[PDB]
């Protein structure tokens, strides 16, 4: 058989704990070498949200890795190297453009994408419930909503 596997990981720092593990131990393929070649080839993107593609054929157990790019919003900042408010959304409204982006890329958990958006939010200055993107994804990383 083969499988493609399309999931989200942090730019360089791919663990072999979930998503990767769970999707790919599976397939009997090593996860460390499949997380090795994607921290290889995320390098340039550090700290950032890439989509990665992993293809294996389950008999062979030989797999290749695609990865795709950040969103422009995180190579922006990249560039810029090395804190001004300018419109507020809801978390209702944050929720309703993750719900798009996850229907048109599958490999996007509502997580994900609320991450993302929560994400590029502070790259425009904009808060979510007059919070600040950060603060809030905070609130979500603990384990404290699923009821928005
Ligand atoms: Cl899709």
Redesign the pocket.
């Given at each position: 058989a083969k499988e493609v596997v399309?999931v989200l990981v942090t730019g360089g720092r791919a663990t072999a704990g979930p998503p990767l593990g769970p999707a790919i131990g599976p397939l009997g393929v090593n996860v460390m070498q499949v997380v090795k070649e994607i921290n290889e080839k995320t390098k340039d993107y550090e700290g950032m949200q890439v989509p990665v593609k992993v293809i294996v054929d389950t008999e062979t157990r030989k797999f290749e890795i695609e990865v795709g790019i950040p969103p422009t919003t995180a190579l922006i900042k990249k560039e810029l190297g090395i804190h001004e408010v300018v419109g507020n959304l809801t978390l209702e409204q944050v929720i309703k453009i993750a719900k798009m982006k996850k229907?048109?890329?599958?490999?996007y958990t509502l997580k994900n994408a609320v991450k993302e958006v929560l994400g590029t939010c502070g790259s425009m200055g904009v808060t979510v419930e007059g919070k600040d993107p950060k603060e809030v994804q905070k609130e979500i990383d603990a384990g404290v909503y699923d009821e928005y």
């Open positions: 399309e229907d048109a890329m599958l490999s």
